[PDB]
Design an enzyme around this catalytic site. Sequence first.
Site, PDB file in Angstrom:
ATOM      1  N   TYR A   1       0.830  -1.197   0.000  1.00  0.00           N
ATOM      2  CA  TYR A   1       0.000   0.000   0.000  1.00  0.00           C
ATOM      3  C   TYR A   1       0.867   1.251   0.000  1.00  0.00           C
ATOM      4  O   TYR A   1       0.750   2.076  -0.909  1.00  0.00           O
ATOM      5  CB  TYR A   1      -0.962  -0.003   1.196  1.00  0.00           C
ATOM      6  CG  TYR A   1      -2.102   0.976   1.036  1.00  0.00           C
ATOM      7  CD1 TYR A   1      -3.230   0.639   0.301  1.00  0.00           C
ATOM      8  CD2 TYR A   1      -2.052   2.238   1.611  1.00  0.00           C
ATOM      9  CE1 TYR A   1      -4.275   1.529   0.143  1.00  0.00           C
ATOM     10  CE2 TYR A   1      -3.095   3.137   1.460  1.00  0.00           C
ATOM     11  CZ  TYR A   1      -4.205   2.775   0.724  1.00  0.00           C
ATOM     12  OH  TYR A   1      -5.247   3.661   0.566  1.00  0.00           O
TER      13      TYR A   1
ATOM     14  N   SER B   1      -5.086   0.135  -5.138  1.00  0.00           N
ATOM     15  CA  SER B   1      -5.614   1.497  -5.090  1.00  0.00           C
ATOM     16  C   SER B   1      -4.627   2.557  -4.619  1.00  0.00           C
ATOM     17  O   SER B   1      -4.871   3.754  -4.800  1.00  0.00           O
ATOM     18  CB  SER B   1      -6.837   1.541  -4.175  1.00  0.00           C
ATOM     19  OG  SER B   1      -7.140   2.876  -3.793  1.00  0.00           O
ATOM     20  N   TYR B   2      -3.528   2.147  -4.000  1.00  0.00           N
ATOM     21  CA  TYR B   2      -2.340   2.985  -3.953  1.00  0.00           C
ATOM     22  C   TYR B   2      -1.178   2.054  -4.256  1.00  0.00           C
ATOM     23  O   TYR B   2      -0.203   2.434  -4.911  1.00  0.00           O
ATOM     24  CB  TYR B   2      -2.188   3.689  -2.604  1.00  0.00           C
ATOM     25  CG  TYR B   2      -1.176   4.818  -2.629  1.00  0.00           C
ATOM     26  CD1 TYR B   2       0.186   4.567  -2.555  1.00  0.00           C
ATOM     27  CD2 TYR B   2      -1.587   6.139  -2.735  1.00  0.00           C
ATOM     28  CE1 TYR B   2       1.111   5.600  -2.582  1.00  0.00           C
ATOM     29  CE2 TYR B   2      -0.668   7.175  -2.759  1.00  0.00           C
ATOM     30  CZ  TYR B   2       0.677   6.901  -2.686  1.00  0.00           C
ATOM     31  OH  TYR B   2       1.590   7.929  -2.713  1.00  0.00           O
TER      32      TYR B   2
ATOM     33  N   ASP C   1     -16.336   2.004 -10.935  1.00  0.00           N
ATOM     34  CA  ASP C   1     -15.519   2.555  -9.866  1.00  0.00           C
ATOM     35  C   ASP C   1     -15.715   4.065  -9.825  1.00  0.00           C
ATOM     36  O   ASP C   1     -15.468   4.756 -10.819  1.00  0.00           O
ATOM     37  CB  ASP C   1     -14.047   2.210 -10.077  1.00  0.00           C
ATOM     38  CG  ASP C   1     -13.194   2.484  -8.843  1.00  0.00           C
ATOM     39  OD1 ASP C   1     -13.439   3.483  -8.135  1.00  0.00           O
ATOM     40  OD2 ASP C   1     -12.246   1.710  -8.594  1.00  0.00           O
TER      41      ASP C   1
ATOM     42  N   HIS D   1     -15.053   0.309  -6.314  1.00  0.00           N
ATOM     43  CA  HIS D   1     -13.629   0.357  -6.007  1.00  0.00           C
ATOM     44  C   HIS D   1     -13.200  -0.856  -5.192  1.00  0.00           C
ATOM     45  O   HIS D   1     -12.226  -1.541  -5.530  1.00  0.00           O
ATOM     46  CB  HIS D   1     -13.318   1.649  -5.259  1.00  0.00           C
ATOM     47  CG  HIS D   1     -11.865   1.843  -4.985  1.00  0.00           C
ATOM     48  ND1 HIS D   1     -10.913   1.791  -5.979  1.00  0.00           N
ATOM     49  CD2 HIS D   1     -11.201   2.080  -3.831  1.00  0.00           C
ATOM     50  CE1 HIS D   1      -9.723   1.996  -5.449  1.00  0.00           C
ATOM     51  NE2 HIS D   1      -9.870   2.174  -4.148  1.00  0.00           N
TER      52      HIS D   1
END
Lengths: 724, 724
Positions: free
Chosen positions: B505, B588-589, B666, B698
Amino acid sequence: RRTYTLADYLKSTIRMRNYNLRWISDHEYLYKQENNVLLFNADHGNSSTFLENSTFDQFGHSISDYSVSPDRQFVLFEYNYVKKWRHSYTASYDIYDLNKRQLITAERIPNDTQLIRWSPEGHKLAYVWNNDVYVKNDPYSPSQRVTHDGREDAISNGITDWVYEEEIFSTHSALWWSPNGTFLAYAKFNDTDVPRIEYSVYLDESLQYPKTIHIPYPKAGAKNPTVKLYVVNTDNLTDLEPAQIVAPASVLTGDHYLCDVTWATKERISLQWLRRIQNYSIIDICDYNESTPKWNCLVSRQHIETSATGWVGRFKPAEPHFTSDGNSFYKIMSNSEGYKHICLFQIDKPDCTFITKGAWEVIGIEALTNDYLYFISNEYKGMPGGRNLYKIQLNNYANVTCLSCELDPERCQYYSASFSKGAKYYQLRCSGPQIPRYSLHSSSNDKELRLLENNTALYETLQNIQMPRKTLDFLHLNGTKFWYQMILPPHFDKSKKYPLLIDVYAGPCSQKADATFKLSWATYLASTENIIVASFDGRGSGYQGDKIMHAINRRLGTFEVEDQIEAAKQFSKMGFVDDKRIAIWGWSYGGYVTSMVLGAGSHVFKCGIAVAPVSAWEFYDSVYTERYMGLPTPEDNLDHYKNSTVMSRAENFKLVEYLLIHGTADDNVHFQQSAQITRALVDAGVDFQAMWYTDEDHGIATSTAHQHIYTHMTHFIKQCFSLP
Amino acid sequence: RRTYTLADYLKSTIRMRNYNLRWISDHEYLYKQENNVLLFNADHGNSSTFLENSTFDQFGHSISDYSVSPDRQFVLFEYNYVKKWRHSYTASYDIYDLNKRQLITAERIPNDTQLIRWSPEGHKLAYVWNNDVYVKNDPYSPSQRVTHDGREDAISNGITDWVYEEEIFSTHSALWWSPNGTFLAYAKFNDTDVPRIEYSVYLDESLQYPKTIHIPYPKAGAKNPTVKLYVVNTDNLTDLEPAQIVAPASVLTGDHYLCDVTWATKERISLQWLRRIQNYSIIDICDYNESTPKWNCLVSRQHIETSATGWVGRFKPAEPHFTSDGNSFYKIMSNSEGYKHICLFQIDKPDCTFITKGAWEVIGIEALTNDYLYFISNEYKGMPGGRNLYKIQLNNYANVTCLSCELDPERCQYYSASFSKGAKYYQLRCSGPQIPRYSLHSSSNDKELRLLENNTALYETLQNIQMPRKTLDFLHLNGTKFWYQMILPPHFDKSKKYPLLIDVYAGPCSQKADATFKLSWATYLASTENIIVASFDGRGSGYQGDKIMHAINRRLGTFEVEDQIEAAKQFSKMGFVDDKRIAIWGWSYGGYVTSMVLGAGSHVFKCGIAVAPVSAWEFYDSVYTERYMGLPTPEDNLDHYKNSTVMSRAENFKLVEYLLIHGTADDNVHFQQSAQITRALVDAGVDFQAMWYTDEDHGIATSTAHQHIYTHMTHFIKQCFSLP
Ligand SMILES: *[C@@H]1O[C@H](CO)[C@@H](O[C@@H]2O[C@H](CO)[C@@H](O[C@@H]3O[C@H](CO)[C@@H](O)[C@H](O)[C@@H]3O)[C@H](O)[C@H]2NC(C)=O)[C@H](O)[C@H]1NC(C)=O
Ligand SMILES: *[C@@H]1O[C@H](CO)[C@@H](O[C@@H]2O[C@H](CO)[C@@H](O[C@@H]3O[C@H](CO)[C@@H](O)[C@H](O)[C@@H]3O)[C@H](O)[C@H]2NC(C)=O)[C@H](O)[C@H]1NC(C)=O
Ligand SMILES: *[C@@H]1O[C@H](CO)[C@@H](O[C@@H]2O[C@H](CO)[C@@H](O)[C@H](O)[C@H]2NC(C)=O)[C@H](O)[C@H]1NC(C)=O
Ligand SMILES: *[C@@H]1O[C@H](CO)[C@@H](O[C@@H]2O[C@H](CO)[C@@H](O)[C@H](O)[C@H]2NC(C)=O)[C@H](O)[C@H]1NC(C)=O
Ligand SMILES: *[C@@H]1O[C@H](CO)[C@@H](O[C@@H]2O[C@H](CO)[C@@H](O)[C@H](O)[C@H]2NC(C)=O)[C@H](O)[C@H]1NC(C)=O
Ligand SMILES: *[C@@H]1O[C@H](CO)[C@@H](O[C@@H]2O[C@H](CO)[C@@H](O)[C@H](O)[C@H]2NC(C)=O)[C@H](O)[C@H]1NC(C)=O
Ligand SMILES: *[C@@H]1O[C@H](CO)[C@@H](O[C@@H]2O[C@H](CO)[C@@H](O)[C@H](O)[C@H]2NC(C)=O)[C@H](O)[C@H]1NC(C)=O
Ligand SMILES: *[C@@H]1O[C@H](CO)[C@@H](O[C@@H]2O[C@H](CO)[C@@H](O)[C@H](O)[C@H]2NC(C)=O)[C@H](O)[C@H]1NC(C)=O
Ligand SMILES: *[C@@H]1O[C@H](CO)[C@@H](O[C@@H]2O[C@H](CO)[C@@H](O)[C@H](O)[C@H]2NC(C)=O)[C@H](O)[C@H]1NC(C)=O
Ligand SMILES: *[C@@H]1O[C@H](CO)[C@@H](O)[C@H](O)[C@H]1NC(C)=O
Ligand SMILES: *[C@@H]1O[C@H](CO)[C@@H](O)[C@H](O)[C@H]1NC(C)=O
Ligand SMILES: *[C@@H]1O[C@H](CO)[C@@H](O)[C@H](O)[C@H]1NC(C)=O
């Protein structure tokens, strides 16, 4: 000896030439050479430089196209070309005066002009701008606005909407000049209540927010656009309003289409209308009654065409080719046995008279004079996948004379022709199955005047390459002869067993097996990876009779699917095809068939690729869909609309390798369709592969995207066939 | 012995229990047991059924959730639940009287209700319907309408928009009752000029045309919504209007956020405002005047927070925890050495006093008494990944006593608590590293009163399985301690060599290397496929100091990327890691870092997976992006907005296998971001793998999709890691 590698296909290293010309007389044509535009005279062999390439780049900017006036006084230069869709665009046009040899500066043609067409004679202009029709009696003459209700996505005058351009006209144009140029016929489309498709466009990395593109797109059963036909007198345009030609009563019982507008004489117009249930077509013959003055469409010259086994025509009703006096015409119609042949119509007579017959179809009518009629047929050697030029004597119908059969029977079995005015000369174009060829002929004695292009450079370049071979052969399914083709690897050994890859379209009136010469992706696989690439024309295919063609009617996804499987089963019986290394792929209907094949539970195919596939007929446009499947109502054909979805076949995808490709900017086969598939594959515990191509249209053709999808599919097939 | 199968993760056969309770008093809590709601009395220990499972089913609809009035007279029932976004929804509500055992049918709560909240005392109701605030002093009463300018996508009264819901409030509610239930404070948002992201939703196969979803989404630099704060006198409203509380002048120099609203006393309110440039926040203490001005905000009791090295707080400034008198409040602030510690603020005095110190941070303040303050820190053994409960005597700041460090130091190291009203009792909540455990305690002696849930069956059912082991270790980067975790395969042999999967992450103030216990996909890869799954927390990570965390400020995609590489290189130097089988993945990161790592060309990672990645900070929302990257203006930080795109690293993807996944629906990380990557990867001629999931948000969480994505990712790993 070198082989046809993948880079050879994707880099267009091996270029194939052609010879594209524009007949501007009965004996003169224009041809672009070294960026110059040369004017050839076929009556004397002499040719002058008609348009220097010097006067192509010395304007301010790059010119995309040209269109010389029929009187050779002015030239239209097209620039700032912005692509709209398949055949549509908007661009700016300049007028180059050839009498002064100077560029016109006043009364110019506006930017963002959508359409433009010269008159058949002289130098009158008609263009479409903001969905309105404008006319210019002369380049040095102000524009006259004809219509004033041009509304984007609501009203279009003179240009087609999406479905008409795609599925009916196959051109953006809805202007029809009269032979003298006096009259203009234009069409008005109304997509006000036509539902809209919306998809996002992810442009350059600069665009922070995506764009939403809206397109009137009637899906199966949705509200369809209307069309009206208006005619305008150019010589006295400020006298009356545009005169509407009302459609015949036979077609006014509901929704209907306008499919063709042809001019018989200087004062006679013909309109081909089509019902929405596409088994009813009618031709209306309208004369100009100078008294009132209206367009007099006598009922006694209405001509109906129907179909009992399905729809009319192949994709749309045949267009009439009127005689020099416009009192008769020849049009292709299905005979009693169900073969497309040429019928002779008299304008006032209620019946037509067939002038060709046999167990073979006529592809089209190419030219027409008072003594002979020229046309293309697949009659020679009884091979449906062939095309040859014929002529018919209009006194003795028994005197048919083939003009291309014996020229080079081993090299050329697939011809097409482009004629001049009055059929004085004609350009012959051979497409295969060996290296193409282009020749110039005179109709007086049908002797080759000169060889335009032989592709000799292509010939020697392939001599140094282990090129694959193409076999035209057939087989029998339930007693019906069915043709197929095989691209055979070089040094083919029937004792060895090869992997098989099936190329599918299987669309209604399609033909994937033919004597055509292509440098395709399949050429790469056979020549380099030693894969047999086959294509089989089963039921639902065309040019073999309405029996085979209309077998798929109201039953899309039933017989064209089984017969691809059944033919594949036949191929396994042969001693040179690996049972465990059979695959399949298609595009926009093969992708439908390829998908529907893998879901059949056949245990025949190991893997498959679907590129921009149709997933349900509920999602495709009404013109193409309702022609073969009818309306999705519980009272007409809703049953098989549901029974023919790819999603209903998800569980059987556990047995094959599925690769699904689709572009996001697809305006033809919406990304909605592939998305519905994956949802059925995901919900069923089925694993598969996918790949989207962002901002790519239906025919993924951007240089970067064209190379990527095939380089991606090569890796997939080599992994499925266990290839290096 | 068996292993943790993939089906063990995706089907959750091996369940982990937890004890969730609602403190409704100082000694009582509600708990759900076999769809019965039970009332427990902590004092003695007996129990009684508060709400039968006859309900939730005896009414015509399945009831989603429940809420009980503080005076214990009425209960809310939630049905017709329709999920809106992450923390939002819209549902219908029924009110149930307990003294009469009846369902209220007069003055019902409307359908499509967007919010509902009880007063903290009594039974006053406040719901938001069509973006307007309605109030009921009694369930058997009409609803007085407070606001009337509600409009979809334009104005919201009492509920947050998307950005406030996700990045500031972490809740859909923008209501704040006063303790006496006399005052109601509500915020009003205005997205009128905020751009709207649009994406298509492909509903059921029967849904013909797709639905375009518009959402006010301010990307980096775009116009943010405006926010105003109003307060209403609920006792006497028919006379008076709402009263706006204006933000301080310190914050009105431009755009600003409203980050917290807290009621100090029955007549005192605290508002946290935040500048758009998130290095300046202020707390405003506002008192009620019995005359006009309704709310008098003294200037001398403004309290301001700044950061010179980056942004303020972890994600948002710490919320204030007032004392009983409302004349002082404790809140978490960074000290001179850059460590989040508790500071004591006095309303009128302008400075605060740190009551804690040391090279470690405080996670949150759990409860406040007039004698003690309970909080969570990571001080024990200097482990940032550990959480323990401490308590401070508010007189002797030196008396700092831990209440959880030494209960089960081998099993439990990651605690949390849920205190009662007045902190008589508190539920201890242990989350790892061993099997979780839930116990109930008394504050008077910190003596375990009873064991709520021990997860015994989970303990037994796990000893049948070759379960992995997770090590919390650390390494030094340039002389700075950095912690990592390693899920190790069972029967670990440091002589062997294992493949390496790096879960990433690495976001700002993120913690992937903690002492927690999760049954995750990493367990399967270690238990079944013998893969070491590691997670590294380098620069930009939180709970370790603002020197470490704020090093990422205005330089996203630079340091958290490089550190993941070098840590992997330090993993390569270890004797038990296969240098040729190192892979990385993130969400997502991590997808951003994974894509940015694979593009660095380090030759370290063989393959990578990026699920819903950020591709360019230009595309993400303003509240999150501007906080760490500033404004994409040529004057502030436009450059590293450009320099930090994944697309600028396309070429170096030729050296790695890449699998890109994204959901079509998303709203958090828009599909646009993935699509921009593939275009760059297509424009660079790099082959990769992609997979979309239709209508998945998402957090791809649909039961079918969740299984399919982890199944699809496993095949990718095994093929990349050369496994069966
Ligand atoms: C283009 O097509 C649109 C719709 O297909 C046409 O507008 C629509 O016209 C119909 C009637 O032809 C209107 O429907 C109803 O008419 C009745 C008549 O009694 C009236 O009582 C109803 O109140 C209703 O109006 C419909 O409203 C109208 N829709 C519009 C204007 O949006 C339009 O005339 C066509 N234009 C051209 C140039 O073909
Ligand atoms: C919600 O936000 C919108 C958009 O910011 C607000 O409406 C807008 O208000 C501005 C003024 O702040 C208007 O801009 C211009 O102001 C100048 C001042 O002289 C004036 O000359 C212009 O004619 C124009 O008024 C803008 O037009 C307006 N936009 C609208 C109404 O669409 C709106 O007031 C906000 N609502 C709430 C409840 O806060
Ligand atoms: C083009 O043809 C049209 C119709 O045939 C001509 O229009 C008529 O021309 C005749 C003589 O040729 C006149 O007697 C009529 O009065 C005309 N009527 C109308 C309605 O035009 C037209 O003159 C021809 N133009 C050219 C340039 O050949
Ligand atoms: C064109 O096709 C339609 C339907 O495909 C035919 O409609 C039929 O009309 C008869 C009336 O004579 C009805 O009894 C049938 O029920 C209709 N069929 C359907 C499926 O609705 C129509 O007859 C066809 N036209 C021609 C000339 O064959
Ligand atoms: C036009 O190209 C064809 C090749 O398609 C040439 O025909 C070949 O000529 C060679 C002579 O070296 C023969 O050996 C081949 O058998 C011919 N092939 C075919 C298919 O006919 C032809 O010579 C070329 N003509 C000109 C004028 O260049
Ligand atoms: C279980 O706890 C309840 C809490 O409400 C106890 O409630 C008792 O209720 C009676 C009713 O008249 C009172 O007289 C008692 O004083 C209450 N007890 C206490 C401790 O306050 C109840 O007693 C408990 N269970 C049992 C079996 O006694
Ligand atoms: C809740 O608290 C508010 C304010 O603390 C009370 O309102 C005040 O009550 C006193 C005496 O009842 C009056 O003199 C004031 O004028 C009131 N002020 C306002 C603003 O209302 C309220 O009565 C309390 N109510 C309950 C139920 O506790
Ligand atoms: C909050 O951040 C901004 C932006 O980084 C800081 O603004 C800078 O202020 C100094 C002194 O006024 C200027 O020299 C810089 O040019 C400013 N930068 C920008 C981008 O405008 C501001 O100082 C920070 N606030 C605090 C309290 O440190
Ligand atoms: C509560 O659960 C824990 C572990 O989840 C149990 O602790 C284990 O007990 C066994 C005895 O059967 C010992 O062999 C283990 O060493 C213990 N592990 C730890 C970490 O202490 C405990 O027995 C359970 N208690 C109850 C009352 O069920
Ligand atoms: C223009 O035409 C002449 C004619 O021979 C030719 O030599 C020249 O190369 C051409 N230039 C371009 C750019 O096509
Ligand atoms: C060809 O010759 C004829 C007669 O000599 C002449 O009129 C004609 O213009 C020539 N062709 C061209 C293109 O100039
Ligand atoms: C309802 O509660 C009773 C009492 O324990 C229990 O026996 C029953 O199984 C429960 N039913 C459901 C559907 O939860």
